[PDB]
Design a protein around this nucleic acid. Structure first.
Ligand SMILES: [Mg+2]
Ligand SMILES: [Zn+2]
Ligand SMILES: [Zn+2]
Lengths: 99, 471, 1226
DNA sequence: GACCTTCCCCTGATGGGAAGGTTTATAAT
DNA sequence: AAACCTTCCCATCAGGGGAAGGTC
């Protein structure tokens, strides 16, 4: 099975790992470690930024890939904003500082 | 144990039960307190002036007869015409005779005819609040006139109470303390405006409530005692019969609602059944309290069970449909037909399917999917909101194609098209809207638009745009 | 757009800041319109519109009037996505404590008042009152009382005496509390009063106070006055198939909190008694706490389902869910998977990718490249063109694949090689072709295993897949310099088959010009392949200045080795192809090729070797049949003989000559010594089986049995499987370990019978389960390793320390296990190492000890090299390139930016899945004792008196090649510094593990039977009689003598009484505690210990890993320390080491330190970044604690960055972070 | 040409109905 | 669960008016 651009989970904007073949492959922690071992940094980023999360990253990367321009515009993983919500909805206040 | 259900289950074992003695014993105490607070209103001219306004408006179609009175301690509609002029036998004997010597022992017989008319608690509470607002109004003036002399002029509190206790009406006490030559005396001429005019809202009360400033304090002084008696009795009542609420609440286990929620929503109905109970009828309290307890549990369930709240009526109707389908399992052998309950029920036929269609419950997204793996329902949930990128690219391409094509037409047609449609502009414009700032109106634009849409309908200038249509 | 993540306490007003409304009605979508209800949990007015750029009422639909709150509903028509950002709050009626600040082990509210937890828990449940701010009364400021205690207490003091009950009391107590005045008082209680008891909680309470102030957040906020709600998009109610609605448990819990708060307010305004309202308050606290963390009070279940609903905190921690299954590992687009197969024709750099897979994968590239070349009008048309499978799109796909690397991954990713980049090769079908040479690195077979593909997007990810991840760039493993690319089964078999010779092959002994003619002989069918023919061959060897010189000459060889010579590269000589050429030989040949000619030649050499191997191994027949297994005709006898050897032992036990556990060994020993007979019966009959006439003279040579060549080549069949194949297979034992006195007596060829198969079944089950259930064990170990490592990267050029660990060969017992050259290769010297003569220079201060210096130091007798290590390096938040070493896929110095921590953790984690009389000197030399006390006795010879005694051997070189230990009272026949003959017995006396092991070694766990150590020199002395345990005093020599200790008498001693014993001596026997090894010895001794022990368990089986890696873990274990004095200073080692040393450069006095020893899981606990900790550690705790302190994370590291989705500060990310951080903060 | 009858669009009525609220009396712990 | 009752929101019906059509 293989997938390039499929659906996404509602809760966390991640490629639906269902639909039994149309779903995206899982890139667990060990895979991230293997990437960390090499100097590959943009590979890991585009993995967990463009190809999974970043409601804008997927769209921008796709609109670029067709223009012959292979360049990612990394944003913010939606899972992390959801984590900020789930932590801040508690009696915990998490925030971000300067540019 | 830990769980807060244990704190409660053994918090009631303290106050011993009350049967055959307790009930009738402390109900008399309840009534003996409300009798103290009731006669407090018996002497309140504002209550008379307020009763006249709400009385004559009953004969003018505003307020119902049985909506202002629960009865008379003296369901008969004929017992009314006989107690609306016989009670005035003391109405005008003490009011216009102040012109106030013999008007001191003739106030009880005028107030006696005022305790034979049981008003509905709705207006009764307004009367209690009326006396409360009168006390607060009178008192505001005292807490004004006091701190204007003590906290400002530095006078002893006792020299204030000594000169104030007894008058509380005129200025004969204030201007008399000027000759005391005390250290606070020389500071009484500056506040002679915040204390003199202060009686304008204090002394005037006397001509409204027809009573001295001090009597207004006596009334509430005893009224508070009466209401305290009532409170202290009813709390013990509900504490005693508390166990009954649990006995009733244990009949609703899997009601989409925790146990303590049920027992509490039932305690509310227990309190309600208490406040509206008369020990005179003889009927035991266990029979009466059960109605309000069980109803405040049932309706509460109907209101807090479903995550999607449903009006009470629908809950009743659905449960009835379920009952009929239950008692017919043994008749049909397995289960009734869909259009069968239509007749057994009072409702019509076609409403059954909708009533049952909406009767679904939400499934927790954490419900593990098949294979029993950690995979849950919330993992297979898609997102049909975001448009796929394969279409976003088409949008960004059509934008440019339309831009180039429109830039191929004339200037007039260009702005007219970008106007009639919301192209690269906030909010497209109507016909006369375009004509408003294009110097020729109402049909000029109607011709320009058709001409441009035709110059684009022609090929060799539409191929690019025409490809974007695929059907 | 951000470079700092902070976490602080949530104030009841800072909550009202975010909230866009107050949810009042505990409702949802209506019931009949499916529309949100006013002030409900989904209220569009409070949170946000249902549709996109559309209001709930339906009056404003156009995208024009965006910012406007339609007075109809109050719903500002905007992006519906904002319903994911829209917070909310609830006006809680009665105060409610936050469970997290009361239930966590360091109970925040608990030691914020020094008030024990069991007291506050009684106050909350409304089962006791509590005093507050008494001032001057009979009661304190914090004191508990019961019903009857509060009864006649208000009469004594109506005013100035307040005492509340429940959450109101706890809160108001936290409000009137002075976190300032109390602090100034707790300072002296730690100053004067001794007795650690007076310093147990105080030393941690003063810290909570001062940090509670320094952060800024106030203690009253420990009680949630306003409960914030979660956006409805994070807890959707979305419908589903069939009409059923799917909701989250967060809803049920929120709805509960709202219901109960409403009920409480209704009572408070309905004039209810206390027995009702106090029950409602507790129900409210219960619901709120179960909403934040469900499973700490009573585990509030859900509705129709019995399963407990998931609360807020539960949506963060755990291997499942957020932070572990979301932010570190996510699914990805542009990927796939399939069943992998062979693919020999492929090069070592390319892999076969199925066509349809490539089409679906590169869809976005295909569309654009089509619309560009004038073949598709617009993107939509290109979609239909590829959806129709038009012919042109195949060539378009071939144009887009061209040099576009892809990534292949094997399901368990142990090491970094688990993901490797290959060059796509379009292929028909659906199977993924994989290169056989890489199957070793991937650790995959072709029995159905599946692999995943990943397509890079950025030009960067395409370059990193060519210059970092490409297959031909990863040849030698980083864990050990040995190449990870070595021929497997078929290849080595074909080569070994060619490089063989019998004696009488068709036309042997003749001569030929060279390889061309030898192949002309083989292919024609005139000559054999195994002939002993000697021919001429030109062996190139670049000599004398680097100039290639081809010296042609004749040599003795075979027709086969000479043919194989055609593949061999230029620089390599002919001696590499003159042997049997087994697996263990082909590998070393390829290794010499690599470090002689370079990367580029080695690659093509490997590919050629594979092709030729497979071809020859195929055409050699090379099969197996029933007749191949040669059952020794002596078997029958050899069996019955040892079968009757027990018939005497049986009567020996039946009469009473031997007891049970005595004749047991009588059977076991004769059976074990008889199994060698049957095993060697087929062995010596199979190693010389084939018998042929050399020119006409009968003679036996190396056998040609099909099964045996597979063994002598190492292709598949090992040695034990041979003893099992033809002869009977041993004796099994029950799970007890009771080996059965009933061995197997039948072989595998003849066939096992019913009885014998049962014990085999147990053996099989033990192996199967022990290997299967071990997966999670090794995985867990390597996981904790990576969590202790990550932040460690190579940044600093050179630290500037001469320290260096002292590298000496392992030489132990009989013979060396690993020479000094290995544990020094590629490392760096610390101090100038010289010849055996003093005042010389064999090597300067610090230089890369590559192969050259290795040979140079090997010439001399210098067996002791001072090498710098990572355990000792002057560097802050990193390491210096020199101290690490060089080891990589290249022999060059480690680059500035590679994250050595992760690669080391993997280098230890991948090999984890493989684990579970007198002395006789050998070599000639001279006896050299070490640390021994001796005394002459009757015999005149020498006897040892010191328990510890080393027996080195100073040969004519001056080195040590022998090291034996001899116990107390030994028999010596030479003495110290005495000459010995060829194996003279100079010693005589009367003698009267796995992965769970290395886990303990890393965790620094205290041993079961510790061994006391000495703290100073001097004569030791006894002391007071046996009271409870015993005593022992320390008698120093010159300095102060306050040291002593209590050692139980139930534990035997070893140290000598009236004898000097230096610090760190063996005061008793048993294992050793690393904590006690750091104090009395130092920082180098402990690391030298952990490495030497952890290396043994791996040395047992076939595992080799450079000490460097383990050194990195040791260095990460002592990153903490304890301060001895205070000094001029006002914990972390690096931070204090710089912060106090900057003022120590100033004339101000410094503060001394003491390295602490934290296990890999205890060191991963404390870390500058709190996010990285809460990622794997106990999230719920970590966040609570790092929240009260107002801790501030700047991320500075790996896992944090991958969380927020940023270029990791390492490698390619380290260069970007370099250029950014340079001008950053400057 | 007016006068009477006719033909369509706003005010506001006001019939219908869904949704809520208050009581219910043998005792009932 | 049934019984009698008030508020609100519905989506629709007599009634008014501004002109409109057609002829003794
Ligand atoms: Mg396999
Ligand atoms: Zn609106
Ligand atoms: Zn260094």
């Amino acid at each position: 099975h293989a997938r390039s651009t499929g659906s996404y989970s509602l809760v966390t904007q991640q490629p639906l790992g269902g639909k039994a073949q149309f779903g995206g492959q899982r890139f667990g922690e060990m895979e991230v470690w293997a990437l960390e071992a090499y100097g590959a940094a943009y590979t890991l980023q585009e993995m967990l930024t463009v190809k999974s999360d970043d409601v804008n990253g997927r769209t921008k990367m796709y609109k670029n890939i067709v223009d012959g321009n292979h360049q990612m515009e990394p944003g913010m993983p939606e899972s992390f904003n959801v984590l900020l919500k789930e932590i801040r909805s508690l009696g915990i206040n998490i925030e971000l500082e300067d540019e | 144990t830990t769980d807060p259900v244990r704190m409660y289950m053994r918090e009631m074992g303290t106050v011993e039960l009350l049967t055959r003695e307790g009930e009738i014993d402390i109900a008399k105490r309840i009534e003996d307190g409300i009798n103290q607070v009731q006669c407090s209103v018996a002497e309140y001219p504002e209550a008379i002036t307020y009763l006249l306004e709400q009385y004559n408006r009953v004969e003018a179609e505003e307020a119902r007869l049985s909506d202002l009175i629960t009865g008379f301690v003296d369901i008969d509609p004929e017992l009314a015409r006989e107690k609306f002029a016989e009670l005035r036998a003391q109405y005008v004997v003490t009011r216009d005779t102040i012109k106030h010597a013999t008007a001191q022992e003739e106030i009880l017989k005028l107030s006696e005819v005022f305790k034979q008319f049981r008003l509905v608690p709705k207006q009764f509470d307004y009367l209690v609040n009326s006396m409360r607002v009168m006390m607060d109004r009178v008192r505001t003036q005292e807490r004004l006139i006091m701190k204007l002399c003590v906290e400002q002029c530095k006078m002893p509190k006792k020299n204030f109470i000594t000169l104030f206790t007894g008058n509380e009406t005129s200025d004969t006490w204030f201007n008399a303390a000027i000759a005391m030559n005390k250290p606070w005396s020389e500071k009484l001429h500056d506040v002679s405006e915040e204390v003199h005019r202060a009686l304008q809202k204090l002394q005037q009360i006397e001509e409204e409530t027809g009573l001295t400033i001090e009597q207004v304090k006596d009334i509430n002084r005893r009224m508070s005692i009466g209401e305290a008696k009532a409170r202290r009795a009813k709390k013990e009542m509900v504490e005693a019969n508390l166990r009954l609420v649990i006995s009733i609440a244990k009949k609703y286990t899997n009601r989409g609602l925790q146990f303590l929620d049920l027992i509490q929503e039932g305690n509310i109905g227990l309190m309600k059944a208490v406040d509206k109970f008369e020990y005179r009828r003889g009927y035991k309290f266990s029979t009466y309290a059960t109605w309000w307890i069980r109803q405040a549990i049932t309706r509460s369930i109907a209101d807090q069970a479903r995550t999607i709240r449903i009006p009470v009526h629908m809950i009743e109707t659905i449960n009835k449909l379920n009952r009929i389908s239950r008692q017919m399992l043994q008749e049909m052998g397995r289960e009734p037909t869909p259009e069968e309950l239509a007749e057994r029920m009072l409702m019509p036929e076609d409403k059954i399917r909708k009533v049952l269609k909406i009767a679904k419950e939400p499934i927790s997204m954490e419900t593990p999917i098949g294979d029993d793996e950690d995979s849950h329902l919330g993992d297979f949930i898609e997102d049909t909101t975001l448009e796929l990128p394969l279409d976003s690219a088409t949008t960004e391409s059509l934008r440019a194609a339309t831009h180039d094509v429109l830039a191929g037409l004339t200037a007039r047609e260009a702005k007219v098209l970008r106007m009639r449609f919301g192209i690269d502009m906030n909010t497209d414009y109507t016909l006369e809207e375009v004509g408003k700032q294009f110097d020729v109106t109402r049909e000029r634009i109607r011709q320009i638009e058709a001409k441009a849409l035709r110059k684009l309908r022609h090929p060799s200038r539409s191929e690019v745009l025409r490809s974007f249509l695929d059907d | 757009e951000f470079d700092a993540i902070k976490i602080a306490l949530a104030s009841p007003d800072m909550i009202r800041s975010w909230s866009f409304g107050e949810v009042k009605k505990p409702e949802t979508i209506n019931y009949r319109t499916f529309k949100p209800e006013r002030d409900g949990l989904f209220c569009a007015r409070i949170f946000g519109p249902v549709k996109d750029y559309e209001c709930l009422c339906g009056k404003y639909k156009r995208l024009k009037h965006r910012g406007v709150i339609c007075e109809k509903c109050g719903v500002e028509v905007t992006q519906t996505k904002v319903r994911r950002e829209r917070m909310g709050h609830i006006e809680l009626a009665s105060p409610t404590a936050h469970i997290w600040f009361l239930k966590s082990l360091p109970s925040r509210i608990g030691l914020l008042l020094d008030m024990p937890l069991r007291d506050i828990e009684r106050v909350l449940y409304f089962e006791s009152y509590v005093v507050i701010e008494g001032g001057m009364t009979n009661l304190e400021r914090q004191q508990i009382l019961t019903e009857e205690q509060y009864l006649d207490a208000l009469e004594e003091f109506g005013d100035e005496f307040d005492a509340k009950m429940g959450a109101e009391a706890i809160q108001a107590l936290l409000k009137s509390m002075d976190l300032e005045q109390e602090c100034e008082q707790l300072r002296e209680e730690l100053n004067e009063t001794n007795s650690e008891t007076k310093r147990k909680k105080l030393t941690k309470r003063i810290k909570l106070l001062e940090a509670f102030v320094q952060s800024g957040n106030k203690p009253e906020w420990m009680i949630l006055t306003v409960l914030p709600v979660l956006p409805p998009d994070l807890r959707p109610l979305v419908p589903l198939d069939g009409g059923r609605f799917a909701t989250s448990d967060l809803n049920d819990l929120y709805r509960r909190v709202i219901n109960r708060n409403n009920r409480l307010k209704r009572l408070l305004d309905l004039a209810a008694p206390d027995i009702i309202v106090r029950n409602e308050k507790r129900m409210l606290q219960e619901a709120v706490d179960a909403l934040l963390d469900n499973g700490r009070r009573g585990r509030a279940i859900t509705g129709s389902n019995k399963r407990p609903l998931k609360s807020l905190a539960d949506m963060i921690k755990g291997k499942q869910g957020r932070f572990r299954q979301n932010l570190l590992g996510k699914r990805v687009d542009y990927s796939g998977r399939s069943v992998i197969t062979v693919g020999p024709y492929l090069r070592l750099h390319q892999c076969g990718l199925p066509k349809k897979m490539a089409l679906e994968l590169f869809k976005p590239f295909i569309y654009g490249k089509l619309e560009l070349r004038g073949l598709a009008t617009t993107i939509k048309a290109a979609k239909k063109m590829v959806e129709r499978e038009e012919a042109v799109v195949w060539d378009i796909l071939d144009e887009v694949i061209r040099e576009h690397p892809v990534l292949l991954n094997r399901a368990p990713t142990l090491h970094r090689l688990g993901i490797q980049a290959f060059e796509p090769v379009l292929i028909e079908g659906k199977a993924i072709q994989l290169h056989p040479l890489v199957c070793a690195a991937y650790n995959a077979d072709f029995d159905g295993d599946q692999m995943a593909v990943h397509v890079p997007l950025t030009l960067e990810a395409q370059l990193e897949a060519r210059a970092l991840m490409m297959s031909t760039n990863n040849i030698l493993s980083p864990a050990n310099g040995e190449p990870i690319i070595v021929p497997s089964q078929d290849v080595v078999l074909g080569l070994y088959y060619m490089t063989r010779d019998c004696v009488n092959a068709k036309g042997e002994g003749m001569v030929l010009t060279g390889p061309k003619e030898a192949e002309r002989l083989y292919r024609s069918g005139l000559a054999s392949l195994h002939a002993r023919v000697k021919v001429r061959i030109t062996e190139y060897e670049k000599d004398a200045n680097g100039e290639l010189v081809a010296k042609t000459s004749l040599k003795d060889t075979t027709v086969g080795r000479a043919i194989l010579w055609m593949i061999v590269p230029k620089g390599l000589p002919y001696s590499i192809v003159n042997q049997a050429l087994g697996k263990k030989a082909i590998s070393k040949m390829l290794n010499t090729c690599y470090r002689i000619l370079g990367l580029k030649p080695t690659v093509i050499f490997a590919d050629q070797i594979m092709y030729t191997g497979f071809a020859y191994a195929a055409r050699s027949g090379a099969s197996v049949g029933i007749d191949d297994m040669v059952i020794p005709e002596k078997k029958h006898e050899i069996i019955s003989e040892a079968e009757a050897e027990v018939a005497e032992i049986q009567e020996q036990f039946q009469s009473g000559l031997v007891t049970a556990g005595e004749r047991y060994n009588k059977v076991i020993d004769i059976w074990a010594a008889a199994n060698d007979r049957v095993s060697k019966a087929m062995m010596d009959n199979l190693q010389t089986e084939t018998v042929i006439n050399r020119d006409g003279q009968e003679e036996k040579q190396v056998s040609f049995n099909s099964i045996y060549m597979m063994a002598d080549s190492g292709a598949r069949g090992s040695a034990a499987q041979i003893r099992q194949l033809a002869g009977m297979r041993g004796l099994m034992a029950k799970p007890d370990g009771s080996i059965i006195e009933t061995p197997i007596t039948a072989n595998f060829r003849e066939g096992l019978n019913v009885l014998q198969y049962f014990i085999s079944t147990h053996g099989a089950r033990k192996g199967l389960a022990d290997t299967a259930l071990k997966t999670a064990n090794s995985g867990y170990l390597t996981r904790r390793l990576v969590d202790v490592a990550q932040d460690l990267v190579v940044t600093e050029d050179d630290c500037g320390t001469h320290e260096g660990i002292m590298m000496t060969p392992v030489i132990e017992g009989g013979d060396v296990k690993e020479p000094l050259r290995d544990r020094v290769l590629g490392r760096v010297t610390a101090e100038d190492v010289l010849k055996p003569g003093t005042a010389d220079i064999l090597v300067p201060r610090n230089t890369l000890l590559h192969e050259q210096w290795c040979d140079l130091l090997e010439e001399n007798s210098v067996d002791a090299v001072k090498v710098r290590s990572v355990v000792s390096c002057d560097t802050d938040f990193g390491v210096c390139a020199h101290c690490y070493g060089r080891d990589l896929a290249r022999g060059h110095i480690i680059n500035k930016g590679e994250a050595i921590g992760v690669i080391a953790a993997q280098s230890i984690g991948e090999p984890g899945t493989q684990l579970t009389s007198s002395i006789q000197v050998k070599n000639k030399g001279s006896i050299k004792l070490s640390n021994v006390k001796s005394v002459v006795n009757s015999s005149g010879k020498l006897v040892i008196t010191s328990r510890n005694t080393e027996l080195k051997l100073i040969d004519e070189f001056g080195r040590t090649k022998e090291s034996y230990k001899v116990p107390y009272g030994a028999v010596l026949a030479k003495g110290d510094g005495e000459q010995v003959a060829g194996g003279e017995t100079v010693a005589n006396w009367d003698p009267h593990g796995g992965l769970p092991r290395v886990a303990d070694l890393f965790e620094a766990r205290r041993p079961k039977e510790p061994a006391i150590l000495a703290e100073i020199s001097g004569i030791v002395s006894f002391g007071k009689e046996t009271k409870g345990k015993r005593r022992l005093v320390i008698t120093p020599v010159d300095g102060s003598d306050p040291y002593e200790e209590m050692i139980p008498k139930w534990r035997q001693l070893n140290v000598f009484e009236g004898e000097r014993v230096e610090r760190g001596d063996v005061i008793s026997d048993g294992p050793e505690a690393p904590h006690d090894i750091l104090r009395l010895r130092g920082v180098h001794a402990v690391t030298r210990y952990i490495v030497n022990e952890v290396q043994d368990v791996y040395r047992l089986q076939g595992v080799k890993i450079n000490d460097k890696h383990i050194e990195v873990i040791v260095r990460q274990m002592l990153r903490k320390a304890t301060i001895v004095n205070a000094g001029s200073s006002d914990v972390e080692y690096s931070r204090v080491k710089i912060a106090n040393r900057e003022l120590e450069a100033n004339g101000k006095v410094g503060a001394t330190y003491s390295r602490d020893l934290l296990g890999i899981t205890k060191a991963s606990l404390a870390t500058e970044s709190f996010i990285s900790a809460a990622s794997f550690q106990e999230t719920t705790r970590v966040l609570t604690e790092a929240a009260v302190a107002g801790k501030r994370d700047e991320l500075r590291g790996l896992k944090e960055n991958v969380i927020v989705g940023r270029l990791i500060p390492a490698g390619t990310g380290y260069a970007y972070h370099q250029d950014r951080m340079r001008r950053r903060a400057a």
